[PDB]
Write a protein that binds this ligand. Structure first.
Ligand code: NA
Ligand code: NA
Ligand code: NA
Ligand code: NA
Lengths: 315, 315
């Protein structure tokens, strides 16, 4: 296959025996990590929830608690992320990004620029239920000025939906972005915020093309020269997710691994969250952009059982 | 007229009185820029040298020094470029392109792809005499890998000259370019370098046509997809100068002015260096390519005495 996810529903699914295999893998000194991977990375997220249920009822134990106790470090993080329902995983990642003194702005941007409208609503509902604060409120206490405004707009949605295309308004929006940045002293960043957070995807694709026609620059090139900081990063992520969301994630993956070190938090979250959606597309775009396979990047930059499970999520 | 240069030798040429007019234009507070333009833009480069001689002997002053002291910014640059002998102007532009930490690769390409063999030899001789380094040596210290190799080949000449046309070798060169790029994994860039820097103009025109016949793509289209960076830009400039040098300069002019900003360095160098050679052809090709006049581009993108003198060089 060449598009869609890498992890699919397993055939012959037997949740009671999967639970047995996982218990045997952990019981006693030592762990059979290959069995844990060979079951869980070959079940989709829905099926992993059925295994959690069957493990409680037939093992009389808590599968997430046992996995947490038995596994450590990056391997634990991937397996626990894989075990978590989609909405709650995003909720937990947003909370972790804001918990305590720091802020993981890159995570906030990645999730809030890339999730679809219904996903965003579910995240808001579950975050508030779980923590007793709204996501918007936590974003406002962790961010300021224009960056706060873009993230709050992304949480509120309200972007025009659907695809109707008014050629005259496309032209005026492109002219207005040109006049708000490149053509003027300073940048009217509210105009950037307004157009990029309010227009529907189809309109914006047409605005980007027109912007290039009238300025000789890609809109990303003008966002980079005209804005800075986390606000710039947020605008770029919105543009990239509009143009080609799999290539946005391919870039996140490349930047998490290229050069010194690995940003494991980002590598893990992207691999877990996109495995069932568009990982095949992400792979194809990664190879197009970087002329190396995603598989070979993971293989070359990680090790151990962590590596083995990421390579299966990659396919 | 419709071909050749825009600036011609003036009739009634009186170098002593031209020198007087230029001195009066500058003497004292203020400058009569219209008189400076009205003399110098209406004399050819040879005649401007006779005015320099007459200014020393009858004014007892140095005309280039006075013009430098009195004029500023882009207007100064055009007037001083106009005052400089052809070979030395190219020499000074190549030196400026490499002086200090940066490199103006676009200037290196523009001059070295477009000048004729005897011009290139004169540039090499004068550059070494003036600076005590060879042009080749400075190009090698400022450029690397295949880009260095193409620029050094252009400086050495040695391209086959004349026009004899062997149909069988035309065919084999087109096949070899196809097999060295589009038909294969990777690109054999030495083969591109070899054919584009070694064959004579007439042969190459026949190779380009054949390349299109066998690949369905223009050679520029394959150079763009198969090569990158300054090496790509160099190959394209060589192809364009072989096909139609006035259209090459028309394109340089368009790109210097279209969209945000103006690349004054390129605009000035092209207007000064081509005024007496092929500016009428450049104008005709600019209009064909871009469906606007060159005059109207200059008028719309520059101002002041700078604009007035460029509009006269344009005709
Ligand atoms: Na925080
Ligand atoms: Na600006
Ligand atoms: Na240099
Ligand atoms: Na190739």
């Amino acid at each position: 296959e060449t598009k869609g996810g890498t992890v699919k529903a397993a055939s012959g699914f037997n949740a009671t025996e999967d639970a047995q295999v996982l218990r045997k893998a952990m019981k006693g000194l030592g762990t059979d990590e290959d069995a844990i991977i060979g079951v869980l990375a070959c079940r989709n997220t829905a099926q992993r929830q059925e295994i959690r249920t069957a493990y409680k009822s037939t093992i009389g134990r808590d599968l997430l608690e046992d996995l947490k106790s038995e596994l450590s470090s990056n391997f634990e993080q991937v397996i626990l992320g894989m075990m978590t329902p989609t909405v709650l995983y995003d909720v937990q990642e947003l909370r972790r990004a804001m918990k305590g003194a720091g802020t993981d702005e890159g995570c906030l941007i990645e999730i809030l620029a890339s999730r679809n409208p219904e996903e965003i609503r579910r995240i808001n509902q579950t975050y508030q239920q779980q923590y007793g604060r709204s996501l918007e409120e936590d974003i406002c206490s962790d961010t300021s000025f224009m960056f706060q405004r873009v993230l709050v707009s992304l949480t509120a949605g309200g972007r025009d939906e659907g695809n109707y295309l008014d050629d005259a308004l496309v032209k005026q929006d492109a002219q207005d972005l040109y006049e708000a940045g490149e053509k003027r002293w300073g940048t009217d960043e509210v105009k950037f915020l307004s157009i990029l957070c309010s227009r529907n995807r189809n309109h914006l694709l047409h605005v980007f093309d027109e912007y290039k026609r009238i300025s000789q620059k890609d809109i990303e090139q003008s966002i980079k020269s005209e804005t800075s900081g986390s606000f710039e990063d947020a605008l770029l992520a919105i543009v990239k997710c509009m143009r080609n969301k799999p290539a946005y994630f391919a870039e996140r993956l490349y930047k998490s691994m290229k050069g010194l070190g690995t940003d494991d938090s980002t590598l893990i979250r992207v691999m877990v969250s996109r495995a069932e959606i568009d990982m095949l597309d992400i792979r194809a775009n990664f190879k197009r952009l970087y002329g190396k396979s995603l598989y070979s990047f993971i293989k070359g930059d990680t090790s151990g059982d962590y590596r083995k499970v990421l390579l299966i999520l990659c396919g």
